[PDB]
Amino acid sequence: ATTGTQGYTVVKNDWKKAVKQLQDGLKDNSIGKITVSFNDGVVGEVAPKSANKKADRDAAAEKLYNLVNTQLDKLGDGDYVDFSVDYNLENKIITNQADAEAIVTKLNSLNEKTLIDIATKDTFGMVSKTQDSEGKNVAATKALKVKDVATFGLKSGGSEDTGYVVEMKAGAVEDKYGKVGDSTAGIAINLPSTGLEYAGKGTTIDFNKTLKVDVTGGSTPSAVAVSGFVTKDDTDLAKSGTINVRVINAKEESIDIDASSYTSAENLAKRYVFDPDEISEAYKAIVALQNDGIESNLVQLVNGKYQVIFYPEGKRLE
Amino acid sequence: ATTGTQGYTVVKNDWKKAVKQLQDGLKDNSIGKITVSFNDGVVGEVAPKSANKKADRDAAAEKLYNLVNTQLDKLGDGDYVDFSVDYNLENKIITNQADAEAIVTKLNSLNEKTLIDIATKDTFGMVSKTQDSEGKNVAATKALKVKDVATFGLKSGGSEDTGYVVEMKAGAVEDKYGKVGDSTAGIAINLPSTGLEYAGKGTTIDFNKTLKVDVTGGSTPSAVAVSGFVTKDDTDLAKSGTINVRVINAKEESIDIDASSYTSAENLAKRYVFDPDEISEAYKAIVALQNDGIESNLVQLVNGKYQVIFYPEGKRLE
Amino acid sequence: NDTIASQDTPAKVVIKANKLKDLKDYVDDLKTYNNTYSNVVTVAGEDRIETAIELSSKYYNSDDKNAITDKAVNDIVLVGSTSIVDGLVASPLASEKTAPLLLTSKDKLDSSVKSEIKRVMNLKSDTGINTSKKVYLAGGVNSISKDVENELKNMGLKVTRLSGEDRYETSLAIADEIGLDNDKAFVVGGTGLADAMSIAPVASQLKDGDATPIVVVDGKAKEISDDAKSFLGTSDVDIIGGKNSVSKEIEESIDSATGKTPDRISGDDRQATNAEVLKEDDYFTDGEVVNYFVAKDGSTKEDQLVDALAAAPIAGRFKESPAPIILATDTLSSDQNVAVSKAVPKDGGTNLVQVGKGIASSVINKMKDLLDM
Amino acid sequence: RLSGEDRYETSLAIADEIGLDNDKAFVVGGTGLADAMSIAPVASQLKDGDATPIVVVDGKAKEISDDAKSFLGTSDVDIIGGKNSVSKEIEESIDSATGKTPDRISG
Amino acid sequence: KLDSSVKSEIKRVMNLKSDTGINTSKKVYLAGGVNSISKDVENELKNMGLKVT
């Protein structure tokens, strides 16, 4: 790994859970290869012989731990372990039937979210497939919720080898999109034809982008679509590529701004000296995200909170 | 690799010297591969991409050190590092011009050693090529020394890539073997035609077997021969194969019986409990070696001393 | 969702917030406090002599960020510690000759000054004393005695004395050595000690490579001296100080001699004139002066301006942005307050150098306020 | 010897030896002797081989120790005992340090 | 008491400053026990922000 690049920085105390995420990454198939480096020098490659087989992925995960466990557990001041992680978030699967069912429940917790409301004379919404005897659109029986459009559950051919994979099956909707008492026929609702599988795809389900309606036409609509599973990279880096993980011999300082007592930005400056560019780049990524909606790896939504990361040069004198 | 197998057990404090020998072994091409294991699990392979290139051998040695230095330097109680070393002592070259000259000096320090003494009326030895005026053998000018049978020096064409290779060139000897005043013609001295190259070829020159005379025929000798380089391996193990080295977190107790103060066998028993079979097998190999001429891998002549190795179970109670 | 940290980092700081705006503000405050924890130096010893030595050790034959020279020097400018009048125009000399301006007692060369001379010039037994190792004494025998000059000569150095019967002849001796090669010169009155100190940093600005000479003239005379006229030749002149320091008669005299109309930079007192030097565009650019020096003004005693004399060469050559000297013992004038405010960018100052001890804390605090420090 | 100058440092010495590998830990107040004994059986419940560590913290302090914060890392914490044993200030401190909302079991 | 002359040479030879982070590589080895170099002196070196072994 190279200082400043996009990637995860794990502290020594959390080496076991971070390495567990890489092991899970190897087991769950997010990770095709991990090149391991002790300090600046490359020492080993971890890669399953065949991604299709469970044993090969577990073997890769055990070897990973055995290789880095003393180096990490006995990490001295100035030492570090770098993992160059060849991944493909699209190949990540759920290796435990209990965890797959845990993701199915995550998706099922959205079932009652209304996507489109029932239509009115004033506001567009859900209407029926067939018009009344007078050729006018009549309101639909129910609102369009996530339960209508797709069902969830683990895939039929699932196993620990191929993975349990939560699967969405596009439903069928006879109902259309329009206004009540209107003569023009309702617009057909395009259901999910892509993103039908979620293998925990080296990602977490982005509920803001997943199963979201996209009405086209504004005040005068002409087309309606519903997205399938749209994931967000647990790191902002692309759905395929290479990310760097680095463990260091540093203490974790969690600064939660919503808390009653946290290290004030003032006392933080008094205790450590920070790289000005590390701060300014994070600040620019925050401003860009706030003003233009532009996403960045530097600032990210994680567990209902926006987070930034700083690695100070060292402590301040006196 | 496995407890009890033939191989070396290095203590933690000497991990650097042992790893240096493996590094030197990779650099000089004695070693084609080192499979490294942290505790019982394999974690990496060290092997030069191309044996003919210096850089690839140096890279292999640096990777070896980088991989194992924290694991060895920070080795905890109960932890260990195993090296399975694929070697081929025959591919060993001498990759440093300083080391090659160090071996040429080793060989040159033998030059004045007498192999065959001058003949007398009483004793068989070195005689002249042609008989006197009366048809009798006359004594030779000088004894047959190693300077007379071969010259030493590094081979031409050498480089760090291909290697320097210390080389023997058979000399020429006009003198023969017989008794002075004897009518039977002197026997031709057969010089080394094989074993002419030695790069420190993953082995050490066995001077007891190298450049040694073999007289055949008795009261009437009929043939005399001189061997070239006959080696004995850095290990007791064959000219090529695989060696197991293991570093452990134990203190080295050097018990020299020739010393003024050493741990008495009584106090040694009082401080530790020893495996009875480890003791009795070592003792039986000593008895066989003492009463009969029988050599064994359990008891070995190393640095002018007979050695046994014990790894006690643990400390004794009280 | 993270970057790869340096291995030598003491901590992983993860800053979290429910609202992106609260995060934005925390990171903005962090940036501010991080950048601000660093900038205000004092340069002073127990004596004025020690203050000059502290200045020489910090700015000449020094690795310091604002040093005038990093290598051993070939020239010293020496001034009588009590006689500000004699060494008055020596700052631009020190600037152009790349030389520290030191102070010495009149009768005995101070051991501390002797040590600094050897240190800054690197004087040795194995090295030949070519005709270039020089010590300039800026002043006559009543400012720097013969005993001291002979003591410098005894060390093995060429000692040139730039002097005359008074401040005027002494000033020309010094100005002649500086050389008038940019077709430009400065003029100050005999009693305009503070004015000479106000312009000393400017004169000390190397402008197209050369410092600009300062000449002291009899401000109440009908005409300037023939020596002043000859030296000034056909050059542009800037007069520093009011009519009570340099009369209108003298301005005409300079005009007639040079054939060119002289400029005048002045106020109602010394602190005002100091402010005006800063306001003048030829010397400093508005919103582009970040570096500042502070020294006593001489209100309590005139000879206490020696700190400014020794500091001015440094201020003139400081980095790539020349610095003025604010003259203030106990208090800053209203004009100085305004001048610094208009000179400094909206973003504030980047260097503040207090020269000497007896400057009140109010002054430094006020300068820190004006420069946003 | 797993020890320190006081009950708190001693508790971390012990909790460190247990190891925090299930992303879970227990916390009790200095005077919460009975509370530590109440949770001791639970902490002693092994899940996939590991027990859960218990840490004693200064219940009347403004913040928990840096050692406690470091040890706890980014784990889920369950506090045992009321506000007189572990103050609300200390609960918040644990929240801020771990980034996860700690639970409280008390009477 | 750490001598002021020694404190100054420490800051000089290691280049320790207010605007610069004291990363974990700045180290001071005290060769001797407390009867050779007191705890007071070790704490003064720690107070400046240096790793003291």
PDB file of N, CA, C and O in Angstrom, chain C residues 28-55:
ATOM      1  N   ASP C  28     -13.672  21.952   9.408  1.00  0.00           N
ATOM      2  CA  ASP C  28     -13.262  23.335   9.148  1.00  0.00           C
ATOM      3  C   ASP C  28     -12.532  23.919  10.381  1.00  0.00           C
ATOM      4  O   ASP C  28     -11.460  24.525  10.280  1.00  0.00           O
ATOM      5  N   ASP C  29     -13.097  23.746  11.578  1.00  0.00           N
ATOM      6  CA  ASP C  29     -12.438  24.166  12.819  1.00  0.00           C
ATOM      7  C   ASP C  29     -11.089  23.462  12.986  1.00  0.00           C
ATOM      8  O   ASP C  29     -10.090  24.106  13.312  1.00  0.00           O
ATOM      9  N   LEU C  30     -11.037  22.154  12.713  1.00  0.00           N
ATOM     10  CA  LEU C  30      -9.810  21.381  12.824  1.00  0.00           C
ATOM     11  C   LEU C  30      -8.728  21.972  11.931  1.00  0.00           C
ATOM     12  O   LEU C  30      -7.606  22.185  12.381  1.00  0.00           O
ATOM     13  N   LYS C  31      -9.085  22.283  10.683  1.00  0.00           N
ATOM     14  CA  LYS C  31      -8.192  22.907   9.711  1.00  0.00           C
ATOM     15  C   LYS C  31      -7.655  24.213  10.299  1.00  0.00           C
ATOM     16  O   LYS C  31      -6.448  24.424  10.344  1.00  0.00           O
ATOM     17  N   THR C  32      -8.545  25.069  10.794  1.00  0.00           N
ATOM     18  CA  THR C  32      -8.195  26.369  11.385  1.00  0.00           C
ATOM     19  C   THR C  32      -7.226  26.241  12.570  1.00  0.00           C
ATOM     20  O   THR C  32      -6.148  26.835  12.560  1.00  0.00           O
ATOM     21  N   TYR C  33      -7.548  25.468  13.604  1.00  0.00           N
ATOM     22  CA  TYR C  33      -6.662  25.316  14.769  1.00  0.00           C
ATOM     23  C   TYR C  33      -5.338  24.647  14.407  1.00  0.00           C
ATOM     24  O   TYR C  33      -4.302  24.989  14.957  1.00  0.00           O
ATOM     25  N   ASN C  34      -5.362  23.720  13.451  1.00  0.00           N
ATOM     26  CA  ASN C  34      -4.160  23.041  13.012  1.00  0.00           C
ATOM     27  C   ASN C  34      -3.161  24.021  12.401  1.00  0.00           C
ATOM     28  O   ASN C  34      -1.997  24.049  12.792  1.00  0.00           O
ATOM     29  N   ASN C  35      -3.624  24.812  11.433  1.00  0.00           N
ATOM     30  CA  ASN C  35      -2.818  25.816  10.744  1.00  0.00           C
ATOM     31  C   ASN C  35      -2.299  26.953  11.670  1.00  0.00           C
ATOM     32  O   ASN C  35      -1.150  27.362  11.556  1.00  0.00           O
ATOM     33  N   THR C  36      -3.104  27.426  12.627  1.00  0.00           N
ATOM     34  CA  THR C  36      -2.814  28.577  13.522  1.00  0.00           C
ATOM     35  C   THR C  36      -1.838  28.430  14.702  1.00  0.00           C
ATOM     36  O   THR C  36      -1.300  29.435  15.160  1.00  0.00           O
ATOM     37  N   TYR C  37      -1.562  27.232  15.205  1.00  0.00           N
ATOM     38  CA  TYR C  37      -0.695  26.970  16.373  1.00  0.00           C
ATOM     39  C   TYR C  37       0.841  27.340  16.275  1.00  0.00           C
ATOM     40  O   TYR C  37       1.614  26.881  17.115  1.00  0.00           O
ATOM     41  N   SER C  38       1.321  28.123  15.275  1.00  0.00           N
ATOM     42  CA  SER C  38       2.760  28.371  14.931  1.00  0.00           C
ATOM     43  C   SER C  38       3.646  29.708  14.837  1.00  0.00           C
ATOM     44  O   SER C  38       4.857  29.515  14.939  1.00  0.00           O
ATOM     45  N   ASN C  39       3.276  31.021  14.793  1.00  0.00           N
ATOM     46  CA  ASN C  39       4.228  32.069  14.192  1.00  0.00           C
ATOM     47  C   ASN C  39       4.988  33.337  14.801  1.00  0.00           C
ATOM     48  O   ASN C  39       5.484  34.122  13.988  1.00  0.00           O
ATOM     49  N   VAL C  40       5.218  33.637  16.089  1.00  0.00           N
ATOM     50  CA  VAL C  40       5.806  34.957  16.575  1.00  0.00           C
ATOM     51  C   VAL C  40       7.166  34.981  17.337  1.00  0.00           C
ATOM     52  O   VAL C  40       7.208  34.622  18.517  1.00  0.00           O
ATOM     53  N   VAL C  41       8.296  35.361  16.704  1.00  0.00           N
ATOM     54  CA  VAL C  41       9.663  35.382  17.322  1.00  0.00           C
ATOM     55  C   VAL C  41      10.182  36.711  17.929  1.00  0.00           C
ATOM     56  O   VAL C  41       9.966  37.801  17.408  1.00  0.00           O
ATOM     57  N   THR C  42      10.870  36.624  19.074  1.00  0.00           N
ATOM     58  CA  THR C  42      11.596  37.743  19.716  1.00  0.00           C
ATOM     59  C   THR C  42      13.102  37.550  19.498  1.00  0.00           C
ATOM     60  O   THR C  42      13.606  36.434  19.622  1.00  0.00           O
ATOM     61  N   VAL C  43      13.845  38.621  19.227  1.00  0.00           N
ATOM     62  CA  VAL C  43      15.300  38.583  19.046  1.00  0.00           C
ATOM     63  C   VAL C  43      15.880  39.684  19.934  1.00  0.00           C
ATOM     64  O   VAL C  43      15.857  40.872  19.598  1.00  0.00           O
ATOM     65  N   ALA C  44      16.339  39.294  21.119  1.00  0.00           N
ATOM     66  CA  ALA C  44      16.881  40.219  22.102  1.00  0.00           C
ATOM     67  C   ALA C  44      17.826  39.555  23.107  1.00  0.00           C
ATOM     68  O   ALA C  44      17.648  38.391  23.461  1.00  0.00           O
ATOM     69  N   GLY C  45      18.813  40.316  23.576  1.00  0.00           N
ATOM     70  CA  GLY C  45      19.739  39.889  24.624  1.00  0.00           C
ATOM     71  C   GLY C  45      19.604  40.829  25.826  1.00  0.00           C
ATOM     72  O   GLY C  45      18.830  41.793  25.795  1.00  0.00           O
ATOM     73  N   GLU C  46      20.405  40.623  26.869  1.00  0.00           N
ATOM     74  CA  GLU C  46      20.328  41.476  28.068  1.00  0.00           C
ATOM     75  C   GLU C  46      20.807  42.908  27.761  1.00  0.00           C
ATOM     76  O   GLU C  46      20.345  43.870  28.370  1.00  0.00           O
ATOM     77  N   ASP C  47      21.687  43.056  26.769  1.00  0.00           N
ATOM     78  CA  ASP C  47      22.203  44.337  26.304  1.00  0.00           C
ATOM     79  C   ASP C  47      21.805  44.581  24.837  1.00  0.00           C
ATOM     80  O   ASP C  47      21.563  43.650  24.067  1.00  0.00           O
ATOM     81  N   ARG C  48      21.930  45.835  24.395  1.00  0.00           N
ATOM     82  CA  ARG C  48      21.759  46.230  22.987  1.00  0.00           C
ATOM     83  C   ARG C  48      22.805  45.542  22.108  1.00  0.00           C
ATOM     84  O   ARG C  48      22.540  45.144  20.976  1.00  0.00           O
ATOM     85  N   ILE C  49      23.995  45.363  22.682  1.00  0.00           N
ATOM     86  CA  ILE C  49      25.124  44.658  22.076  1.00  0.00           C
ATOM     87  C   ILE C  49      24.735  43.207  21.826  1.00  0.00           C
ATOM     88  O   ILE C  49      24.900  42.697  20.723  1.00  0.00           O
ATOM     89  N   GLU C  50      24.097  42.593  22.818  1.00  0.00           N
ATOM     90  CA  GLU C  50      23.669  41.214  22.718  1.00  0.00           C
ATOM     91  C   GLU C  50      22.522  41.136  21.719  1.00  0.00           C
ATOM     92  O   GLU C  50      22.535  40.252  20.888  1.00  0.00           O
ATOM     93  N   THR C  51      21.598  42.095  21.691  1.00  0.00           N
ATOM     94  CA  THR C  51      20.519  42.119  20.696  1.00  0.00           C
ATOM     95  C   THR C  51      21.110  42.103  19.279  1.00  0.00           C
ATOM     96  O   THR C  51      20.690  41.310  18.440  1.00  0.00           O
ATOM     97  N   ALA C  52      22.102  42.944  18.989  1.00  0.00           N
ATOM     98  CA  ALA C  52      22.776  42.951  17.695  1.00  0.00           C
ATOM     99  C   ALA C  52      23.466  41.611  17.377  1.00  0.00           C
ATOM    100  O   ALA C  52      23.465  41.157  16.233  1.00  0.00           O
ATOM    101  N   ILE C  53      24.103  41.000  18.378  1.00  0.00           N
ATOM    102  CA  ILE C  53      24.727  39.684  18.232  1.00  0.00           C
ATOM    103  C   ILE C  53      23.651  38.638  17.945  1.00  0.00           C
ATOM    104  O   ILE C  53      23.835  37.807  17.059  1.00  0.00           O
ATOM    105  N   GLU C  54      22.541  38.647  18.686  1.00  0.00           N
ATOM    106  CA  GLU C  54      21.427  37.730  18.470  1.00  0.00           C
ATOM    107  C   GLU C  54      20.946  37.897  17.023  1.00  0.00           C
ATOM    108  O   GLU C  54      20.775  36.923  16.304  1.00  0.00           O
ATOM    109  N   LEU C  55      20.812  39.139  16.551  1.00  0.00           N
ATOM    110  CA  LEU C  55      20.451  39.416  15.171  1.00  0.00           C
ATOM    111  C   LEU C  55      21.500  38.845  14.196  1.00  0.00           C
ATOM    112  O   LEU C  55      21.145  38.169  13.238  1.00  0.00           O
TER     113      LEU C  55
END
